Ligand binder design. Structure first.
Ligand SMILES: CC(C)C[C@H](N)C(=O)O
Ligand SMILES: CC(C)C[C@H](N)C(=O)O
Ligand SMILES: [Zn+2]
Ligand SMILES: [Zn+2]
Ligand SMILES: [Zn+2]
Ligand SMILES: [Zn+2]
Ligand SMILES: [Zn+2]
Ligand SMILES: [Zn+2]
Lengths: 484, 484
């Protein structure tokens, strides 16, 4: 019928037994001490992230899963740059919820564990799974807050997690289904359901050609799938003339590499080469659901990178919207090409800040893996705001260098103004970022390379195996704090 | 006979002509305005790093090379994390000196350019070249300060640069000449010439075996070249009982990869796989020449990594000095093996701080290239001291993450306590650093991965093509500031 997830902390030295949360101690009382008695009989105490299931304790809750929360007073961890307490909660709740799902129970009530937003994030992120195309599926579990106190915190958590889950769905979906047009239509419907203060323009190829986006066009032409330039507006500020914050996302729905073709091994993961677009767009949908009082513009060039009789050829020279020429030495370095045009266009909105996200380089994954998103920025103020936000969400960011040293390696070019791959193979993520800087004149610009946090195997406990949707929540948190 | 290098700044808006330095304006006066007149006739003004040669202006200086210094008031660059003025000076002076050398002039007098230490660094770093083994060599140039004002600043610069040049020589020298024993003997003689307050112990294999350094021994055994553990003491503090700062360096004189053999292409560069040892040792020699009032200990395990009938075999399990077991899954991840033992030993000196340097991973080069040295540390205080020092020297450092997320990938091990390569190929430099942390219990430890700054092609203007010796000067500066 209905399941229940309860938390218990690790025992502190001067305590006689590990302490339950408020909901845990109360439940124990409701069942006349039966919960504590059975936990004692079952064996060793529960450590952070571990779970244990007890049956028949109450007629309304035939299955009760107790989860280990770790140390009660865990706050900000200086070594890890995150709030440890929140991370323990998200992981423990996800584990509890999955045990309830394995038991095939359709609904679960969750202990707020001293921080309802984090508990909600663990349940919602933890239970997610993309199974639309399978006949064999797990039971759909409805998770709700146990109790009626602090409902707003719980709901804030569901909102944040739902935002990241949308990014995951968009990324996980096979490319033949998640085409440039389909992605745009899904985002449009999600933003419009979130708020009536929105405008969406799924700009077609003719518009792209009118905007002189020759760099973006050179990439798209190799494929038979039509390209689109997604532009979204969220008018949340009281003053309509208030300059917007602009977000830009790389939307390659599928990257085969083009003529500079990729190796077969694990190339299926390239259906998520639109993760940049998925994360910034989901962040705008959430900000819109939250009705944040700020104006926001989202831009996402979308297309496929395929080999054919009309594809980009190594050595070809293309002209960006701003007139700069680019020598396309490697057709698989296509993200920086489409972003050159999107970033130029971003300046037309005379924005307050410009933030782009992209699953850009294999070098970023080699650099930091899934530990943190790499952030390249010309503004320490901006770096600090993103960093602070990440400490709260736990979806970490780490700063990478924007030095002229790297710019030199991309402007040293045989045929044009700038080369799309550096002279050397060293510092791939840094030279890619340097390339993007040639298309930015704004004082507050940040580039997020999310190639390393594209997927999850088991690094983040509360995310099942698959596309991660990172760092959506950090983006939402940043916008939230910015609006205040 | 004698050459002269003079600097000129870029013209500021309200100036009528670009301004010479004090020495430049004075020289012009000595030759009755002849220098300004010829510079005007020659054409365009000189920009940062550019040079122009003028002949017969003075009987004592038949060749005068004027160098562009860029903007006079260039101070700390917030984008680049360095003092721009100093960088302009080092590069301009190096260029001037090389033009004098191409002219085959044996001696040059150098303009202090408003910062004699930086001018000296440019001349000394700029003229260096390892040519001991060649019949064809360039003329040996003696560079001296032009004038007698601020001689201490000039000499400080020669000292710092000479320290980095020694590291370059040690790294550049072919491995058949730069063996573990030879390296130790060269370092010993350099430290002893620098100060009488020193003790050096070139510990032999029997000592290594007594110290139970099974991890370090497993690497060395594959080669016929005897291993040595270099231990150096600099007793500069007034109080002999004052706890020392300990430096540790990876000293692989040649890395073939062992049974997990490297590819042939550019493997010759592996003669510099002892760069970690070269930099920390040269830094201690310089600190000793400077008679810094601090106690310092330097530790450097040295050996070759070769394939043979007795070499490390993939899957073998070895025991570190501290008793932890290590599964050697890849024999080419040998630096972390030798460092495990050296870091354990470092704790026996009950140090104030522990700093190790190593040309450790190819992943670090992929991460940041030669832009900056990667620093992994459990102390933000320590990170800040190294960072501040680097701003002054221009030999930059950039912080990398020490997260438990990476530790998990090395302790997940089939046969032993820790695995010498991670479960995944992502974040190579971070997992290597995590591996090292398992052998450190100190509160102030910093790991410097210098694999990306091992060589110079043309990135650093004042260093000719070859082994760079980075980041020696940043290490010296750190020690200098620490002693004050
Ligand atoms: C590893 C990937 C993120 C590579 C990236 N798709 C590049 O455009 O090919
Ligand atoms: C690129 C190199 C620094 C690799 C390093 N010598 C490892 O032990 O093989
Ligand atoms: Zn997809
Ligand atoms: Zn690509
Ligand atoms: Zn791509
Ligand atoms: Zn050498
Ligand atoms: Zn190796
Ligand atoms: Zn090595």
């Amino acid at each position: 019928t209905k399941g229940l997830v309860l938390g218990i902390y690790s025992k502190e030295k001067e305590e006689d037994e590990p302490q339950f949360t408020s909901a845990g101690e109360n439940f124990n009382k409701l069942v006349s001490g039966k919960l504590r008695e059975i936990l004692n009989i079952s064996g060793p105490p529960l450590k952070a992230g571990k779970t244990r299931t007890f049956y028949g304790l109450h007629e309304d809750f035939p299955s009760v899963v107790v989860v280990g929360l770790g140390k009660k007073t865990a706050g900000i961890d200086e070594q890890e740059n995150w709030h440890e307490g929140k991370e323990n909660i998200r992981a423990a709740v996800a584990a509890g919820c999955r045990q309830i799902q394995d038991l095939e129970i359709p609904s679960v009530e969750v202990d707020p564990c001293g921080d309802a937003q984090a508990a909600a994030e663990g349940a919602v992120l933890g239970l997610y799974e993309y199974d639309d195309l399978k006949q064999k599926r797990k039971v759909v579990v409805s998770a709700k807050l146990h109790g009626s106190e602090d409902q707003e915190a719980w709901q804030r958590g569901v909102l944040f997690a739902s935002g990241q889950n949308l990014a995951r769905r968009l990324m996980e979906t096979p490319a033949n289904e998640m085409t440039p047009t389909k992605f745009a239509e899904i985002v449009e419907e999600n933003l419009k359901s979130a708020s009536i203060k929105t405008d969406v323009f799924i700009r077609p190829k003719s518009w792209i050609e009118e905007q002189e986006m020759g760099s973006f066009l050179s990439v798209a032409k190799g494929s038979e799938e039509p390209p689109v330039f997604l532009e979204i507006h969220y008018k949340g500020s009281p003053n309509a003339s208030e300059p917007p914050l602009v977000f830009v996302g790389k939307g390659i729905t599928f990257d085969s590499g083009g003529i500079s073709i990729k190796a077969a091994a694990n190339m299926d993961l390239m259906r998520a080469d639109m993760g940049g677009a998925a994360t910034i767009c989901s962040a705008i949908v959430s900000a819109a659901k939250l009705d944040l009082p700020i104006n926001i513009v989202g831009l996402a060039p979308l297309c496929e990178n395929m080999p054919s009789g009309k594809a980009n050829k190594p050595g070809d020279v293309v002209r960006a919207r701003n007139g700069k020429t680019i020598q396309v030495d490697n057709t698989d370095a296509e993200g920086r090409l489409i972003l050159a045009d999107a970033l130029c266009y971003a300046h037309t909105f005379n924005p307050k800040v410009i933030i782009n996200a992209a699953t850009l380089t294999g070098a970023m994954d080699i650099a930091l893996g899934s530990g943190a998103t790499g952030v390249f920025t010309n503004s320490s103020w901006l770096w600090n705001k993103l960093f602070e936000a990440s400490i709260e969400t736990g979806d970490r960011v780490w700063r990478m260098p924007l030095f002229e040293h790297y710019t030199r390696q991309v402007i040293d070019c045989q045929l044009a103004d700038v080369n799309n791959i550096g002279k050397y193979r060293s510092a791939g993520a840094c030279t890619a970022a340097a390339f993007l800087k040639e298309f930015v004149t704004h004082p507050k610009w940040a580039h997020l390379d999310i190639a390393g946090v594209m997927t999850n195997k088991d690094e983040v406990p509360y995310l099942r195996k698959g596309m991660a949707g990172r760092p959506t929540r950090t983006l939402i948190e940043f916008l939230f704090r910015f609006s205040q």
